[PDB]
Paper text:
However, in the regions of TRAPPC8 and TRAPPC11 located on either side of the core the local resolution was suitable for de novo model building. An α‐solenoid is also seen for TRAPPC11, with residues 181–566 forming fifteen α‐helices that includes the interaction surface with TRAPPC2L. This region of TRAPPC11 has been referred to as the “foie gras domain” after the zebrafish gene in which it was first analysed as it was noted to be particularly well conserved between species (Pfam domain PF11817). The N‐terminal part of TRAPPC11 (residues 1–180) consists of four β‐strands interspersed with four α‐helices. The C‐terminal part (residues 567–1,320) is less well resolved but forms the arm connecting to the vertex with TRAPPC12 and TRAPPC13. The surface of interaction between TRAPPC2L and TRAPPC11 has a total area of 558 Å. The overall arrangement of the interaction is similar to that of TRAPPC2 and TRAPPC8. As was seen with TRAPPC2, α‐helix 1 of TRAPPC2L is central to the interface and interacts with α‐helices 14 and 15 of the TRAPPC11 α‐solenoid. We could identify two conserved regions in TRAPPC11 that are involved in the interaction. α‐helix 14 (Tyr442 to Ile453) contacts TRAPPC2L between Asn33 and Lys42. The other region is between residues Asp478 to Thr486 at the end of α‐helix 15, where residues such as Trp484 contact TRAPPC2L α‐helix 1 and the loop between β‐strands 1 and 2, similar to TRAPPC8 and TRAPPC2.
The TRAPP complexes are nucleotide exchange factors that play essential roles in membrane traffic and autophagy. TRAPPII activates Rab11, and TRAPPIII activates Rab1, with the two complexes sharing a core of small subunits that affect nucleotide exchange but being distinguished by specific large subunits that are essential for activity in vivo. We report a cryo‐EM structure of the entire Drosophila TRAPPIII complex. The TRAPPIII‐specific subunits TRAPPC8 and TRAPPC11 hold the catalytic core like a pair of tongs, with TRAPPC12 and TRAPPC13 positioned at the joint between them.
Numbering used by the authors: 1 to 60, 76 to 377, 406 to 566, 579 to 626, 676 to 718
Write the structure that this text describes.
């Protein structure tokens, strides 16, 4: 009829490769088969240029398509069914035990040809003539034993191959691979012809079976490296899907199929390096899809799948990087990494909506749809969101794009906020806030500042909390004055260590958590000036440091401190007595204080605001 091409992801993520089989071989031989398999794993030892694509696997109206009709047929074709069958055996040249070799290899090839009769596959046999090498044209018993084979089965002579000694076995394995390339491409072409002949007939114009056929056609082509032909048959299948009706119960499956198709064709793009072509196909179909659905769209569908769309395309971005293309990433390291990240954000928001529509009183299996939601309720951790953010983070960091990755970092911390996970949010914010002050732009600086307020109060890193709060009061004039007053009260509280006021948010658990704090914690702008330095060991300096408050609200005028320095030798507007210098120290030392540390109101500004000298 019109059955799905496949509902199976995680398929052929690596470059698809042929498979030729090896039978169930016992441990008794596996040791020497080790060497045997070594040559086989030699395909994985050698460079891709030397490496043959094929690998190994083990086993013990109109008429309906055979080999195409179902997606498990596709997959079983992919790896379960080898294009060619090869059974490796040993052949010691002897007299009558070698006749027993004849009978035994006859039995095994009889079983093998029965299996082939099940599944229409070409066969080859490999024999180690473990004896010493001899010239070709010497062993008539080779012909005799081939004839014993043929009367048993009829396998052609040339399909027989020999790997006498390991030092010989290696080269004979290389040419084995070459011959296998031969037969494998032969079988692949034969199946290609099968598909095209199938496609020339319609079972009463079902029109979707042929879609499966052209899909499998692309499979064949990419097996045979004709990437262009197969990718364009894929795209033609996309066109065919377009011709199909939309918005039915199928349209979601249509969208997923087109996702498969976009995946494959974009692979074949970047293999052929047609970048903007891949971009155009990507967009074209994805906005097709956004149009095609207006609802249901429970938005773990067509939104999460949108996320997976950008996920696969990011996969193909990194695939290009492994290939080495710098184009789109000089443009945008991952155009779609963070994009899929915001798509999983909308995923989670839609999940919140799902909970909302659930909070309604919540017969065509809508409960299963609700059960869908329950399934969708599972993928609500949104930690995978955080990880996708991490990949986008690193991906943009690849070309050292600090700003963008930093703002994705504040994204991460915001998400941890949404999840209620204050800790690591606070960590990333702790990194960002000095950065944001370095960007000098106070607006978002303050916005992440109140975010940090929430983060630290929830965490209880009240040292960090108050540091951000105080550099916030520095220039908090963009915010409410009364909240400045409240926060200043919080400042005196924390300096005393007594619980801070924003109990309007606080709940007792984290409250106690930070009550634990500050037992360990150990430690608006004004100006420093000098009337005289570099003295003649007679001068007397004095308070040239103008203590200015740029906060509208005052801080309680408590007290003062000055800290002595040792270079060379050891020795609105509010001003009050300090007599900072009356100690007649030694000459030519400019004691410029690291930080002010006078006791106005409380200890200090601590967060790194102190000037040098005159």
């Amino acid at each position: 009829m019109t059955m799905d091409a496949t509902a199976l992801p995680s398929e052929l993520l690596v470059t698809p490769q042929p498979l030729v089989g090896f039978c169930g071989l016992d441990t008794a031989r596996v040791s020497v088969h080790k060497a045997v398999w070594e040559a086989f794993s030699g395909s994985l030892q050698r460079k891709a240029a030397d490496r043959a694509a094929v690998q190994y696997k083990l086993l013990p109206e109109w008429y309906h398509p055979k080999g195409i009709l179902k997606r498990n047929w596709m997959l079983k074709h992919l790896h379960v069914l080898p294009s060619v069958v090869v059974l490796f055996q040993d052949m010691e040249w002897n007299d009558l035990q070698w006749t027993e070799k004849q009978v035994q290899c006859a039995a095994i090839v009889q079983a093998l040809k029965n299996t082939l009769q099940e599944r229409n596959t070409r066969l080859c046999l490999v024999l180690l003539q473990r004896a010493a090498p001899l010239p070709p044209g010497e062993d008539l018993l080779a012909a005799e034993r081939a004839a014993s084979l043929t009367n048993a089965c009829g396998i052609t002579s040339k399909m027989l191959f020999i790997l006498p000694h390991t030092e010989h076995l290696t080269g004979y394995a290389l040419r084995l691979e070459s011959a296998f390339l031969d037969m494998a491409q032969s079988y692949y072409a034969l199946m290609s012809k099968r598909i095209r002949n199938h496609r020339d007939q319609l079972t009463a114009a079902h029109t979707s079976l042929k879609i499966r056929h052209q899909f499998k056609l692309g499979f064949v082509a990419e097996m045979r490296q004709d990437f262009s032909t197969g990718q364009k048959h894929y795209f033609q299948a996309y066109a065919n899907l377009d011709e199909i009706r939309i918005n039915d119960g199928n349209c979601l499956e249509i969208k997923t199929l087109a996702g498969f198709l976009n995946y494959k064709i974009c692979r074949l793009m970047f293999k052929l390096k047609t970048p903007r072509d891949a971009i155009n196909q990507f967009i074209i179909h994805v906005e097709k899809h956004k149009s095609r659905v207006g609802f249901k769209d429970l938005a773990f569908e067509h939104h999460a799948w949108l996320s997976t769309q950008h996920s696969v395309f990011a996969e193909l971005f990194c695939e290009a990087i492994k290939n080495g293309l710098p184009a789109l990433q000089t443009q945008h390291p991952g155009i779609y990494y963070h994009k899929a990240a915001e798509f999983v954000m909308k995923r989670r928001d839609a999940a919140m909506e799902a909970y909302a529509a659930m909070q309604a009183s919540s017969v065509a299996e809508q409960q299963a749809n609700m059960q869908l939601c329950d399934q969708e309720r599972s993928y609500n951790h949104s930690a995978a969101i955080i990880a996708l953010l991490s990949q986008a983070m690193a991906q943009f960091k690849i070309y050292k794009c600090l700003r963008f990755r930093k703002k994705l970092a504040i994204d991460m911390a915001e998400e941890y906020l949404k999840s209620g996970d204050h800790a690591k949010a606070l960590t990333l914010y702790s990194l960002m806030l000095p950065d944001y002050r370095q960007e000098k732009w106070t607006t978002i600086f303050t916005d992440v500042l109140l975010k940090t307020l929430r983060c630290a109060l929830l965490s209880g890193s009240v040292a960090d909390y108050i540091a951000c709060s105080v550099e916030a009061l520095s220039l908090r004039h963009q915010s409410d004055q009364s909240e400045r007053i409240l926060i200043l009260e919080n400042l005196w509280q924390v300096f005393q260590g007594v619980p801070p006021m924003p109990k309007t948010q606080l709940t007792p658990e984290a409250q106690a958590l930070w009550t634990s704090a500050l037992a360990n914690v150990k430690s608006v702008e004004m100006c420093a000036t000098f009337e005289r330095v570099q003295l003649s060991n007679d001068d007397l300096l004095q308070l040239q440091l103008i203590v200015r408050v740029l906060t509208d609200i005052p801080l309680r005028i408590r007290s003062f401190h000055v800290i002595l320095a040792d270079a060379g030798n050891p020795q609105s507007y509010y001003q009050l007595f300090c007599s900072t210098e009356a100690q007649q120290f030694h000459e030519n030392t400019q004691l410029r204080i690291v930080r002010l540390e006078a006791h106005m109101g409380t200890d200090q500004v601590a967060a790194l605001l102190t000037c040098s000298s005159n």
